[PDB]
Design a protein around this ligand. Structure first.
Ligand SMILES: CO[C@@]1(C(=O)Nc2cncc3ccccc23)CCOc2cc(F)c(Cl)cc21
Lengths: 300, 296
């Protein structure tokens, strides 16, 4: 019993964290096999941040300009290339701590663990989700660039995020490990704003199922709803539309608890209307949306 | 920016997790140097232990079986002497924590780490953890520089869904025993110093709506705290909150008048750091560590 926001054990990722210095900029890199991945803005100066031409800046660099530090050991850069917004520094040593890994691009609503690092040193691990507006609500200070998001499944680390930037609202923007940004963001200091955020409806429903599995039933009701009527209501509370895919994904939780998805949808509709009335669900006075249906089954 | 419930990186502890099987019971063990620590309920514990031989304990470190060459009991923890010292043994200490202190838990099943979360030792000595069958022996820890301080080992789940365990010397936290009998957690209280630290973290993150022009005496605050099932705030707590008070310009007793208003009036539809409740599982040190980026 019990329901906690749980991150994956960070050990397999800690052995990959390195410090990457280029000129005055120092950030984090991900050392997998003989390649160090990091945000390409590590080659940026003050005059080259509003409108940087990364191809032009990278061509002027040599391997000895990049200082890579793995613990108290300096790695030798023997090559460099750019793939979208990620810089790939070829090194002369393969990381012996390289775990089994994959690069995966995730969709909004997906969760992952973040290993927050400063100067190639891991300082904390937390869990978060890709928001529907493609930002992440992380905990990041200056120097955290290059910190990665990941999931672990059957000894394999799936790298899904690399931190690049903080937007004016305190939220964070980054890329997958192939350097493709999540969202309409660019790695320029030009005016950029996150779109209005919405609640991850399928995740709130999964958490309501987790609450039922843990014995919390006060919010349940005798009502069901059509998927269209639920979507008309939920959209008014800035909740993401619930698709037939989400309804199908919630199937196992619906079977385990005996509460049909559209019946759980009617309990959610009612919670949005009444609020909690001094009550909590799984120790929370707010509806929690950073647990996917897969996380709920995993934890319960 | 941002404030998250953040655990210590679990890598140094992952290299210590092993599976301990004795009879039909399989749980987790902590392999440090040539000793495997685990809950003694894996086996009148003196009478039961004397009947067990070293070959009855099957210890598995990854896909490698360790051979038990001795066994002893220290309070509610079993210590299995093994022939091999763990090459991944980090610099470590066994520390007993106080209620209100926080630590990271590496939840394991069959000697395999599955998740890491951060939590506080409640004033009633339980932890509001997340554990399933097979999680016994999972450990709680803090990391100070390069040193792992082991402070907790999981033993059981109470009927209310909360968890009970021991320090690494086998001394239970709270009035709990490792036996199937009627046991209930006492009424819980809110960790006052931690709520104040979390209000300072909110101010550091730009959330100021709850601040007011008022201050209070420590005694008047404690009278209000007693009424709302909040732990008493001592002069030690006030002193510990000093650096956060200096950084934000809000005296500890000034933040207490804010907490007092929040307790008597509520949030009024507003949130603090994305929460509609006052969060009490961040210590003053956790707040400083996160809002300054200390690495391990
Ligand atoms: C060089 O990194 C920047 C940044 O956002 N860094 C940060 C990332 N995380 C947390 C942060 C907390 C506070 C301060 C900065 C943070 C600084 C601002 O300008 C820019 C502009 C950019 F186009 C890019 Cl891709 C990065 C950056």
């Amino acid at each position: 019993s019990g329901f906690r926001k749980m991150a994956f054990p960070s050990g397999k990722v800690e052995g990959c964290m390195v410090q990457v210095t280029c000129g005055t900029t120092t950030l984090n890199g991900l050392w997998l096999d003989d390649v160090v991945y990091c945000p390409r803005h590590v080659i940026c100066t003050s005059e080259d941040m509003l409108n940087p031409n990364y191809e032009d800046l990278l061509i002027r660099k040599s391997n000895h300009n990049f200082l890579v530090q793995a613990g108290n050991v300096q790695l030798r850069v023997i090559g460099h290339s750019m793939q979208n917004c990620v810089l790939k520094l070829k090194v002369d040593t393969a990381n012996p701590k390289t775990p089994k890994y994959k690069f995966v691009r995730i969709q909004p609503g997906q969760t992952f663990s973040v290993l927050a690092c400063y100067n190639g040193s891991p300082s904390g691990v937390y869990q978060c989700a890709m928001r529907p507006n493609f930002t992440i609500k992380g905990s990041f200070l200056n120097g955290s660039c290059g910190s990665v998001g990941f999931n672990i499944d059957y000894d394999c680390v799936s790298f899904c995020y690399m931190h690049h930037m903080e937007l004016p609202t305190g939220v964070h923007a980054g890329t997958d490990l192939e350097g493709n940004f999540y969202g309409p963001f660019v790695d320029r200091q030009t005016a950029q704003a996150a779109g209005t955020d919405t609640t991850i409806t399928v995740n709130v429903l999964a958490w309501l199922y987790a609450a039922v599995i843990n014995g919390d039933r006060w919010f349940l009701n005798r009502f069901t709803t059509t998927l269209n009527d639920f979507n008309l209501v939920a959209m008014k509370y800035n909740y993401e539309p619930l698709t037939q895919d989400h309804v199908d994904i919630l199937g196992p939780l619906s079977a385990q608890t005996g509460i049909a998805v559209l019946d759980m949808c009617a309990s959610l509709k009612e919670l949005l209307q009444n609020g909690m009335n001094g009550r909590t669900i799984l120790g929370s006075a707010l509806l929690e949306d950073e647990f996917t249906p897969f996380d709920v089954v995993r934890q319960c």
